[PDB]
Amino acid sequence: TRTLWTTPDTSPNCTIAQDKDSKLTLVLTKCGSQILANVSLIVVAGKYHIINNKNNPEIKSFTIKLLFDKNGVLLDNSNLGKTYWNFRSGDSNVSTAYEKAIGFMPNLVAYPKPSNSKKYARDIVYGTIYLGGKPDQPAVIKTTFNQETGCEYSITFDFSWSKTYENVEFETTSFTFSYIAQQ
Amino acid sequence: TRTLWTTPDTSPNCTIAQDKDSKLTLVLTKCGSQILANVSLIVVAGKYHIINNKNNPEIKSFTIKLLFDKNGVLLDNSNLGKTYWNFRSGDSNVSTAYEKAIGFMPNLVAYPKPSNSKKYARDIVYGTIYLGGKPDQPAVIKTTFNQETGCEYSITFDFSWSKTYENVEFETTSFTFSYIAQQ
Amino acid sequence: TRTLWTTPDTSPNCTIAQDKDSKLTLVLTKCGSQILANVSLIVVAGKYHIINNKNNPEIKSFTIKLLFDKNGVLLDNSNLGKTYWNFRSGDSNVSTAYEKAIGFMPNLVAYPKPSNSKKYARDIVYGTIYLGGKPDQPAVIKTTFNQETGCEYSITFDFSWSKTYENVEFETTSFTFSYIAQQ
């Protein structure tokens, strides 16, 4: 019945380019073997806050990585900030370091690490989100499972966008996906 | 009380242009701190029944708003009709039109009401349907949360389309999205 | 509360053109009135294994039919392998096979049988996925409910190859969706 969330405030809690240059809104909810994911991003400061390509054409994609361990707790090298992310209990988070996130992860069976046994997987969930909420302004949230090393589990976000966006602010829409639980 | 749904019987329950010319087969289900949600539409009379752009090239958008009070009871001036909406029980609706849908609403903190605060695009869920079942006939469904006045919560579906169609019936294909729970 | 899936042990259970020449990774979840499905396919052998639209000029579509009876028990004339498909209950298999109980099927009301009534467009849930996880290489995954014959409930998966593409192995990107349950 439980839910594990990043308090959905406008107070930043994620670093891509510079310290807390972004708030990342993710709510992950579990049912048996299937977890439902609702993600949203606002980029409040730095290089990815404003997209002007007519000056900076090279910036047409960047990536975020939620690395976990054997017990499935989020590492602090992970672009996200540890003091915002915890099992929900009303609007509060219950102000104690959690654990026991075994299962909340992308199944190693269904989504294996890139082990020497050479199979080409089908892990990737593509999608889409539009910046400002304008239709004419699309982007490609590419989410990949269990393709980062050092960790046990991993959820990486590979955002791309080809267009010639001048003073578009990086505040996405909301996108919903599910992934297969390890337990 | 697993589901606050429209009985799925394709009997018009919805007024876009004339008194009950559409059926809205919206369905919503509680997953703690998410609300997983499906939506179809059939328009079976009136100005948005058969679509001919050639003749009516300026007609390529319409809207369906739900408006909910402090207690989360669908306000009457909603496009959808109060006497078609309640919790499912088997095939009927638990034999009532209940007084407690608090918990089945879009969180204000997540998708706040209009302020002098910067409104971000994360209020919006972009998806696409297809009319008939033809690949070649898409339109956009853009659902937005708590962006409407005169109410405490609001779920507004805007249907746009961008293709010069000729004599096309507005029956759509199911879609699925989720939004974070107020409680 | 249960999940009704196939063990993702990349062990070809699905037949398209020739016996067990594909692995269909489908996983269904009771979200009460709604099922939360997540689907995938791998072609390890056959014609569809390796696609090349230069030698075979036609870009033939295909299908994957899952027919259930009055109790929701996958008939044996289906494309998938009947043995591999059950309740994990924590990714186990408790050796009991008396399964007359299942609200995992698509409501016959919200999605009727083809003959007994003129048919509407919300039979279907349209999907779009990339083969090889490459943006330039997209396909189409059309899904239909109770649109088969000599059965009681039928979730059939239509795939379509769009453009002309050369020396690609069939491995689709993950895709997520939901429908209205019978009971």
Author numbering:
A (entry chain C), B (entry chain A), C (entry chain B): 187 to 369
Paper's wording?
(A) 2.5-Å crystal structure of the HAdV-D10 fiber knob protein (HAdV-D10K). Predictive homology was used to model HAdV-D10K in complex with CAR, and the position of the DG loop interface indicated that HAdV-D10 can bind CAR, albeit at a lower affinity than HAdV-C5. Using recombinant HAdV-D10K protein, we confirmed binding to CAR in vitro with a 16.5-fold lower affinity than HAdV-C5K, as indicated by the IC50 values and demonstrated that CAR-binding HAdV-C5 recombinant knob blocks HAdV-C5/D10K infection. We inserted A20 into the DG loop of HAdV-D10 fiber knob.
HAdV-D10 is a rare serotype isolated from the eyes of patients with conjunctivitis. Structural and biological studies of HAdV-D10 knob protein highlighted low-affinity engagement with native adenoviral receptors CAR and sialic acid.
